[PDB]
């Protein structure tokens, strides 16, 4: 049910924000010895009525980019427009 994307990402940008057209609320974060930096976890803006779900972190393979792994898939127009 996920589908990951990886998004080259300007190191100095710690934020872990993915632009994708749709709006997000940020419900939590993980910070782990295994990777040196936070996992961020997202729920989608149409939430409880859209399922989806966002995970973003750096990948530890190549730390340019970050990964981003989506849960489900969209029930709606993405609203930034
Ligand atoms: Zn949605």
Do not use: I, M
């Not at 990951?4 to 782990?32: A, C, H």
């Amino acid at each position: 049910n996920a589908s990951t994307v990886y998004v080259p990402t300007e190191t100095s940008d710690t934020s872990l924000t993915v632009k994708d057209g749709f709006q997000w609320r940020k419900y939590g974060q993980k910070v782990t010895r295994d990777n040196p930096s936070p996992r961020a976890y997202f729920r989608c803006s149409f939430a409880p009525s859209c399922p989806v779900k966002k995970k973003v972190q750096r990948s530890a393979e190549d730390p340019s980019l970050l990964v981003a792994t989506y849960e489900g898939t969209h029930n709606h127009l993405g609203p930034n427009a």
